[PDB]
Design an enzyme around this catalytic site. Structure first.
Site, short mmCIF file in Angstrom:
data_model
loop_
_atom_site.label_atom_id
_atom_site.label_comp_id
_atom_site.label_asym_id
_atom_site.label_seq_id
_atom_site.Cartn_x
_atom_site.Cartn_y
_atom_site.Cartn_z
N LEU A 1 3.37 -8.07 -4.70
CA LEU A 1 2.36 -7.05 -4.38
C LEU A 1 2.87 -5.98 -3.42
O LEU A 1 2.21 -4.93 -3.28
CB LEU A 1 1.15 -7.75 -3.71
CG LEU A 1 0.40 -8.89 -4.42
CD1 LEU A 1 -0.56 -9.71 -3.44
CD2 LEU A 1 -0.42 -8.33 -5.48
N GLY A 2 4.03 -6.22 -2.77
CA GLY A 2 4.61 -5.21 -1.88
C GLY A 2 5.94 -5.67 -1.34
O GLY A 2 6.13 -6.89 -1.26
N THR A 3 6.87 -4.75 -1.04
CA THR A 3 8.21 -5.14 -0.59
C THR A 3 8.70 -4.15 0.48
O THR A 3 8.52 -2.94 0.33
CB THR A 3 9.25 -5.17 -1.74
OG1 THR A 3 8.78 -5.93 -2.85
CG2 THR A 3 10.55 -5.82 -1.29
N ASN B 1 -2.48 -0.31 5.69
CA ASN B 1 -2.77 -1.63 6.27
C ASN B 1 -4.26 -1.99 6.28
O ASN B 1 -4.63 -3.07 6.82
CB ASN B 1 -2.23 -1.75 7.71
CG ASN B 1 -0.75 -1.90 7.75
OD1 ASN B 1 -0.14 -2.26 6.73
ND2 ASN B 1 -0.15 -1.73 8.95
N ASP C 1 -1.36 -6.98 8.35
CA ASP C 1 -0.05 -6.69 8.94
C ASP C 1 -0.13 -6.66 10.45
O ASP C 1 -0.37 -5.60 11.03
CB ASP C 1 0.59 -5.39 8.40
CG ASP C 1 2.13 -5.36 8.67
OD1 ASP C 1 2.57 -6.12 9.55
OD2 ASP C 1 2.87 -4.58 7.98
N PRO D 1 -8.57 -8.47 -3.17
CA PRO D 1 -8.14 -7.86 -4.46
C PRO D 1 -8.42 -6.39 -4.59
O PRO D 1 -7.98 -5.81 -5.59
CB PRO D 1 -8.96 -8.60 -5.55
CG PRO D 1 -9.46 -9.79 -4.97
CD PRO D 1 -9.61 -9.49 -3.38
N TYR E 1 -6.39 -13.56 -0.09
CA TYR E 1 -6.05 -12.42 -0.95
C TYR E 1 -7.26 -11.49 -1.08
O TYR E 1 -8.36 -11.95 -1.43
CB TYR E 1 -5.57 -12.93 -2.33
CG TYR E 1 -5.36 -11.82 -3.35
CD1 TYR E 1 -4.46 -10.78 -3.06
CD2 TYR E 1 -6.05 -11.78 -4.55
CE1 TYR E 1 -4.20 -9.74 -3.95
CE2 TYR E 1 -5.81 -10.72 -5.51
CZ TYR E 1 -4.90 -9.69 -5.16
OH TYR E 1 -4.67 -8.68 -6.04
N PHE F 1 12.55 -6.39 5.37
CA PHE F 1 12.88 -7.77 5.71
C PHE F 1 11.91 -8.79 5.14
O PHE F 1 12.07 -10.00 5.39
CB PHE F 1 13.06 -7.97 7.24
CG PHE F 1 11.84 -7.61 8.08
CD1 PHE F 1 11.65 -6.30 8.55
CD2 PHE F 1 10.91 -8.58 8.43
CE1 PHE F 1 10.53 -5.95 9.32
CE2 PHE F 1 9.78 -8.24 9.24
CZ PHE F 1 9.61 -6.93 9.68
N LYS G 1 3.06 -13.86 2.61
CA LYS G 1 4.05 -12.94 3.18
C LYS G 1 5.29 -13.82 3.44
O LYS G 1 5.19 -14.86 4.10
CB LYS G 1 3.46 -12.38 4.50
CG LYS G 1 4.41 -11.42 5.17
CD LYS G 1 3.59 -10.65 6.20
CE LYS G 1 4.41 -9.67 7.00
NZ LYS G 1 3.64 -8.71 7.86
O1 LIG Z 1 -1.03 -7.78 -1.31
C1 LIG Z 1 -1.28 -7.45 -0.15
C2 LIG Z 1 -2.30 -8.24 0.58
C3 LIG Z 1 -2.03 -8.65 1.85
N1 LIG Z 1 -2.94 -9.45 2.51
C4 LIG Z 1 -4.09 -9.85 1.84
N2 LIG Z 1 -4.35 -9.46 0.52
C5 LIG Z 1 -3.40 -8.68 -0.07
N3 LIG Z 1 -0.53 -6.46 0.39
C6 LIG Z 1 0.42 -5.82 -0.52
C7 LIG Z 1 0.69 -4.47 0.05
C8 LIG Z 1 0.59 -4.77 1.54
C9 LIG Z 1 1.92 -5.15 2.09
N4 LIG Z 1 2.15 -5.40 3.40
C10 LIG Z 1 3.48 -5.72 3.57
C11 LIG Z 1 4.14 -6.02 4.70
C12 LIG Z 1 5.47 -6.31 4.62
C13 LIG Z 1 6.11 -6.28 3.41
C14 LIG Z 1 5.43 -5.96 2.29
C15 LIG Z 1 4.11 -5.68 2.38
O2 LIG Z 1 3.23 -5.34 1.32
C16 LIG Z 1 -0.60 -5.79 1.71
#
Ligand SMILES: O=C(c1cncnc1)N1CC[C@H](c2nc3ccccc3o2)C1
Length: 339
Positions: A38-40, A160, A173, A113, A111, A43, A61
């Site tokens: 879902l994200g990259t 965020n 985050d 959505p 999560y 680190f 994460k």
């Molecule tokens: O998918 C969730 C999500 C998160 N928490 C609860 N539901 C969904 N993302 C995906 C995008 C966002 C994200 N933050 C990151 C921080 C570091 C590295 C990659 C990251 O990608 C939050």
């Protein structure tokens, strides 16, 4: 009112009990199925996973220990997990499990959505003032909670802030969040949202979170941030000048609040005066906000994200799918002993 004082006193008691005795090692990797990235970032990454016995979905994460060390994020990753396992508030994403193995650190969250506020903002162009104000009131309450626990958040931006099934915000985050009595000095955060005292390498405090709320409210209501430029050094010169230009469609009340949150002199900035958060809560721009009803989640949201169920990933984007490899030998065990 005494009711607010007693709420914040209990919040701090409950936080300190978990802060002093953190939970550790509450799941492992092979309890979950991997679904999608879902994200990259540099680190770490975030993956949708499903728990194999319960069928519940979570956002996992994953942080590579060796990259954390190289990018000088050890203390920050230990802060993130220790704070997340101790906080509890309606507008914060909940940590459900954490654990580590020979290669990685893992934080398994609920999560959400509906996706990032950033995607919805860019799809629509800008939010009307009532819509921007519904989200801003959730951030004001969340910073009132965090600051009362001596926590500074330090990463407010639209990517965020996730939008949940009821159309409310959940903040994710905590990688830059820290418990600070007094000042702190680290250079961190995203360029467009940094307060001048961070750019000038000063000792700074919780006032940087109220500057970043001014940047966020400006970007929600305009569609772009106030200090925009092609390269970071250009952004920084605009920030420290603090010269801001407002669109003509902004109300006079919005302009007045923004001039007091985007105040370069931190000793004059709203949120950092003798009356604290109440100078923001009592500002005319928030006259229509029912702060108790927002906290209780009783206000109908401006919109509900479109998604089909708790496993739907359509509101997040597409990334190359890489392995979650775990070395046969333990890496950086000493650095992460407390995790
Ligand atoms: O998918 C969730 C999500 C998160 N928490 C609860 N539901 C969904 N993302 C995906 C995008 C966002 C994200 N933050 C990151 C921080 C570091 C590295 C990659 C990251 O990608 C939050």
């Amino acid at each position: 009112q005494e009711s607010v004082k007693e709420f914040l006193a209990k919040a701090k008691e409950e936080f300190l009990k978990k802060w002093e005795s953190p939970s550790q090692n509450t799941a492992q990797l092979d309890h979950f199925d991997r679904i999608k990235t879902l994200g990259t970032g540099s680190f770490g990454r975030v993956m949708l996973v499903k728990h194999k016995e319960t069928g519940n979905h979570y956002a996992m994460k994953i942080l590579d220990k060796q990259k954390v060390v190289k990018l000088k994020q050890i203390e920050h990753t230990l802060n993130e997990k220790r704070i997340l396992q101790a906080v509890n508030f309606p507008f914060l994403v909940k940590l459900e499990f954490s654990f580590k193995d020979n290669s990685n650190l893992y934080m398994v969250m609920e999560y959400v959505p509906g996706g990032e506020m950033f995607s919805h903002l860019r799809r629509i162009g800008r939010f009307s003032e009532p819509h921007a104000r519904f989200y801003a009131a959730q951030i004001v309450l969340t910073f009132e909670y965090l600051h009362s626990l001596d926590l500074i958040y330090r990463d407010l931006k639209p990517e965020n802030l996730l939008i949940d099934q009821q159309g409310y915000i959940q903040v994710t985050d905590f990688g830059f969040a820290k418990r600070v009595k007094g000042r702190t000095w680290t250079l961190c955060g995203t360029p467009e949202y940094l307060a001048p005292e961070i750019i000038l390498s000063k000792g700074y405090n919780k006032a940087v979170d109220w500057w970043a709320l001014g940047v966020l409210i400006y970007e929600m209501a305009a569609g772009y941030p106030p200090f925009f430029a092609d390269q970071p050094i250009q952004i920084y010169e605009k920030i420290v000048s603090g010269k801001v230009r407002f669109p003509s469609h902004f109300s006079s009340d919005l302009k007045d609040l923004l001039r007091n949150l985007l105040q370069v002199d931190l000793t004059k900035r709203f949120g950092n005066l003798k009356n604290g958060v109440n100078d923001i809560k009592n500002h005319k721009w928030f006259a229509t906000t029912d702060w108790i009803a927002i906290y209780q989640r009783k206000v109908e949201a401006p919109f509900i994200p479109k998604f089909k169920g708790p496993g739907d990933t359509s509101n997040f984007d597409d990334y190359e799918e890489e392995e979650i490899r775990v070395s046969i030998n333990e890496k950086c065990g000493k650095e992460f002993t407390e995790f």
